[model samples]
Each structure stands twice: as structure tokens, then as C-alpha cells.
Target: VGRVVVLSGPSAVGKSTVVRCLRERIPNLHFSVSATTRAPRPGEVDGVDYHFIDPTRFQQLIDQGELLEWAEIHGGLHRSGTLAQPVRAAAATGVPVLIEVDLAGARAIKKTMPEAVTVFLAPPSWQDLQARLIGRGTETADVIQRRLDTARIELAAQGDFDKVVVNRRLESACAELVSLLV
Candidate 1:
């Protein structure tokens, strides 16, 4: 059997960027795209960045017991359905599976899949996290503030993870993450 690598982090901590960097270097690493009830933003592609579904459909999946773990983030719902179909399929083919998600989702997986290699991506400092989110220019100031508030909670959960990757230096973080995956 293979391993499931779950990457969790606070907002604006560059989890996506670090995951992208790891994907570029790691061979046959599979990404478990999440199912979201939230509306897609401009330039967002369905089944690529996320599987954008309607609230009704999302709730239906929850009722049907398809989701491995699900949660509401920033007031919107998201789900990680069974890895048995996706992650298991890839791992059976000799690939390593990866899931980029939040702390809530990660915690859910932990109960069912304790073998997973859980990684917590953290900002070098809280100040850097604020600066990066503001630098992004996509979200409004108020939205950023709300996310920052949530980040504090997520950051507090890092100690629960198997490994903590400090994402201050891109190259260093990427190297550490890749090494952990392998």
C-alpha cells in the first residue's frame, strides 16, 4: 500500500505555492482536489482547482456518506470524498497521493486514516502571513481580516501534525516538503 500526504495550513501561508513546488519535483504525486459548494471566482476552472458544486449537491453527498471528511471554511462548505476511488486508484498504480486542505479537513482524515503523513505548512512569522495576504490583491481588506482571524486558530493546530514545514523560504520549504513526501 502507499501513503496519503495531507498538507494543511493557515490562510495566506503559501500552502498552494509550496504544494505546486513539491509537485514539480516529486514523481507521480497525486493531488486530491476538493469538492466545494462555493462559487468559483474569475479564472477558476472546475475539476482543476476544485470541483465546484451546488449547495444542494454538496449536502446530498454528505447525506449519502460519500465524503471522507467535510467542513465549512470561511462560511462555505467543502468536502474530501473517499480516497478509495481516487487516491487508492493512483496509489495502486504506484503513485504517492497528496491532499492539500485545511486543518479541519486534515483532522477528519486523521481519525479514519492514521497512516497518512500529515504536514502542517506554517508561516515563518505571523507578520509575514498578514503581509502576504495583503500583497495578493485578490481579496478585500475585510475578507483578509476574517481569514487572518481564522488563521490564528489553524496555526494553533500545527503541533498535531507529523511535520511542520515553515514556508518562509520557498526553496527550503519545497526541499523539506519533498523530502518528507518521499
Candidate 2:
């Protein structure tokens, strides 16, 4: 059977880093890359990081219902969405598909595919989370505070996920996820 692994967490939870390490070891795992209207950050590759598109294209995808989930974020200046094509393709292949999404996006995927395994990546502690976000040095003060606020809410919803992976050690968490995927 095809398995879809949906990884969700709050901002700066180290999920992406863990996913990166997981990919290095698990070459068969497919990633459902997201599309965004925002400009790429420094050192971020085009297709590898995200499929960067214009606002118009993003709106078109939303109108056509081609996106599994779309959200207007950063005060409506940026939009991000996960296309249905890659996820569908991965599903058809019966291979493990990895999807990294926000809380709302994870719920959306669950609604569409109830068999999906939603995993929540949690930080070691609240202080550790705050430190990671602060260390990023990206986003404005207002945005950072907004992210922290959202993180608090997401942390409260850990029960919504099928499993919780405490990211105390990056490699250990990645190993746990790899086992879950396989």
C-alpha cells in the first residue's frame, strides 16, 4: 500500500533539517515539494527548495483547485501551496511520500487522504524553540512574535498528530522518521 507521511510542526522546530538528513539516507523517499510566491532566500535552490511562482500563477492554482492547501501568509504578502500532482503521483507508485506542511495543511491532507500518517515534530523545550527562531535572524520582530504566538497554539495541538517526534537530537529524530516511513 502507498504510504503518505505528513510532517507538521511550528516554526523553527528543526523538522526541515531532520527531513534533509532523512533524505540523505533514504533515497527512495519522495518529497512533496511546495510552491510559493515569495522570493527565494539566500542559498535556496529553485526546484529543490521550492517551486517559486508569481502571485498570478499561485492564484490560478488556487482557483483551479490544483493545490491541496493554499494560505496567504506574512500579512498577505506571500502565498504557499502544495500541488496535488506530486502527491498523487507518489501515491500511485506505492512509495513513501514525505510532506512537510503547517498545522492547517496537515489537516487538509488528512481530510483528503485519511490513511496519511501525520507526525508532529516537537522541540526539546519551549526555550529551545525560542532560541532556534531567534538564531535564524530572518523575518522582522513583528513576524517573529507572530510565529512564536502560532507556535504556542500548534504546540497545544500535539494530540492532533498521529505521532510526536521529539527533536532533541537531529540524527536520532531522523532515524525515527525513516523507520516510520519504511
Candidate 3:
């Protein structure tokens, strides 16, 4: 069997950044790019940034059982690599596959693949996390508040994960995480 590593956290918790770092630094780690119905942001590519499928097509994939764990967040749907093609391809390489996703996606992975190694990426502290979220300059006060509320539940669920990594520093945590995978 192949290994599935999940990196889970709330928005603005640097989950993507850590995954990117690991992909760059680790020799064998593969970041399983997610398929999304949400429109791409600036400089985002269709297949690279995301699969960029339409909502109807995404729903059709879900109905067809073409996803390992797919869920809606902020009114948009995101799908992980399914147990079929993409995940199977990765497993064929005999290398571990890693996923960077939100808490809901992580929960879905746990439900679908109970043996997966799940890691919860947490902020150093709530205050620091709030600072990072507010400093991101991406959302309004209302949106930030909503994210903070959601972050609490995600943080509390850390016990369900195999491990917790505090992202106080990106490089250090990435190194530690890469070591864990090895």
C-alpha cells in the first residue's frame, strides 16, 4: 500500500506555503494538486493551480465516484485526487502522496482512508494566527471573523490527527515535516 499524508489547517495558516516548501525541498514528496470549481486567482493556471473544472462537471465527477474526498467550502467545491487515476498513479510510483487541504477535506480523508498519516498545522498562538490572517490583506473584517470562528473548531480537532506541527517558522516546520514523512 501507498502512504497518504494530509496537511490540514484553517485559512491563512500557511498550509499551502508549507506544502510548497516540502515539495521543493523533499526529494520524493508529491503534493497531490486538488481539483477545484472556484475561479483561479491572479497568476493561477488551469491544471497547475487547480484542475479548474466547472461546478456541474465537478458535481458529475462526485456523482461518478471520481474523487477520494470532495467537499464544498465557501460556496465552491474542491476535490482531492481520487482513488482511481491520480492517486493510483502516485501509488504506482511507490512514493508517498501528500495533500494540502482544509479541515473538512482532512475529515473526509480520515473517513475514506483511515490509515492515512494526518498532520494538523497550527499557528503558534491564536493571536499570531489572527495577525497572520488580518495581515494577509485578502479579506474584510467580517470574513476574518468568520475564518477565526472556523479556525477554533479546526484547532480543537488536532487530537484526531496523527501529529500537530506549529507553523511558527515555515522552513523549520517544513524540515520537520519532511523528516516525519521519511
lDDT of each: 0.77, 0.86, 0.75
lDDT of 3 by residue, 1-182 (tens): 55778888766688777877888886777667678777789999876667778778887887887776876665544433433357657766777788776777787778776767789888899999878767857788898788778878777898888889988898889987887766
The candidate maximizing TM-score is: 2
Instruction: Please report, as a residue range, the 10-residue window in candidate 2 with the lowest summed lDDT.
Output: 10-19
lDDT of 2: 0.86
Q: In model 3, what is the error at residue 12, expressed in angstroms?
A: 0.9
Which residue pairs clash in candidate 3?
none
Model 3, runs deviating above 4 Å:
36-60, 73-84, 136-144
Worst 10 residues of 1 by lDDT: 75-84
Per residue, candidate 1 scores C-alpha lDDT tens digits across 1-182 of: 66678888885577777878888998677788677777788999987777887778878877876666787766554433433356667767777888876677788878766778889988999888878767758988798788788878888889999989888799999898777767
Q: Rank the candidates by lDDT, best first.
A: 2, 1, 3
Per-model TM values vs. the true structure: 0.73, 0.77, 0.76
Per-residue alpha-carbon lDDT of candidate 2 for residues 1-182, written as tens digits (9 for 90 to 100): 55788999886687767888978888888898899999999998987889999999988988887888778888898998788877788878877888988899998887766688999999989999988777768779998888788889989999998999999898889988988888
Error of 2 at 59 (Å): 3.8
For model 1, name the residue pairs that clash.
none
Query: Candidate 2: RMSD over Cα atoms?
Result: 3.8
Question: Model 1: how large is the Cα RMSD against the reference?
Answer: 4.1
